[PDB]
Homo-oligomer: A and B are copies of this chain.
């Protein structure tokens, strides 16, 4: 909600409370999942064509006792935007791969998990410097592109250390570069993205699988968003980038996400999605294994812009086998039931 707008600056304070419950045969995926998000979007008019902005978003879990409550920053960045030239922002933000893969990340509860947070330039992560050009200098409405640099987020000790270092190797990265191009026209969307990150010393020298010099993602995507119908698909082919449970990363992975949705006038929105991640030549005796594979059927009912409720059913297609147990990958179904207020 816009709670301030005065003398050239405005501030949107926004958030939500999701009363959320998971039902699953997997005990680790069963029970209260209530949480909230809080954020602000600030924007200031410097001149006719130049605006400064800042954004911050924070998740606070609501399913924990008061002795040990968990929370974190999703994004936190500042930037500058010049009309018919472009923008620059820096901070914790989304990787440019997500400019395309976000198109399928629209399920009621699940989805968007053929990749993780702090997972190279694929989703949210630290220290992105992002240059964006919107509508090609105002000459081609709908044509957007971005170039993105991610600085090294290293270890918390020893060699390859950064000031914001982290001992979990799955959350580290070296210097990376990425780009995205997208074109939207009368509801039809088409986009490509590419990212290339250096892998740090710790992630290649701790005995995990999917070691190598660089992490790489190549993404293509298509969507249709008009007349109350939402169709989208994305295919990403990764190298040393996709996480495989606890085992490490996938030498090669082929990720595919597809979604179909329809918005009824009275507020009902049914959703059918298919997500899949295929590990190829994973090593460690596993050759070719499904890292992820499930069908998602669900529905959100929008009371209005400020309130909704939804059910989401993750029909898990993975087999319980040696690879999934070793990696610690869930192969059980999850049904999500949620009640959501937002402002």
Contacts and interface: CB of A to CB of B under 8 A. Distances in A.
Contacts of A204: none
B34 A92 contact: yes
Contacts of A18: 78
Given A27-B160, A31-B163, 7 more contacts: A9-B306, A9-B343, A19-B91, A31-B152, A32-B164, A44-B307, A62-B76
A307 B44 CA distance: 7
Interface of A: 1-4, 6, 8-9, 11, 13, 15-19, 21-22, 24, 27-36, 38, 40, 42, 44, 46, 50, 52-56, 58-69, 71-74, 76-80, 89-92, 117-118, 124-127, 151-154, 160-166, 168, 171, 303-307, 339-343
B118 A66 contact: yes
A44 B306 CA distance: 6
A22 B340 CA distance: 40
A11 B306 CA distance: 11
A151 B337 CA distance: 13
A300 to B, nearest CB: 14
A31 to B, nearest CB: 4
Given A17-B78, A63-B92, A303-B46, A343 B127 contact: no
Contacts of A124: 66
A164 B16 CA distance: 19
B67 A171 contact: yes
Contact of A79 (B11, B60, B118, B339): B339
B164 A55 contact: no
A31 B153 contact: yes
Contacts of A71: 69, 71
A17 B91 contact: yes
A269 B244 CA distance: 50
Contacts of A68: 72, 166
7 contacts: A1-B4, A1-B11, A11-B343, A17-B54, A31-B153, A52-B304, A59-B66
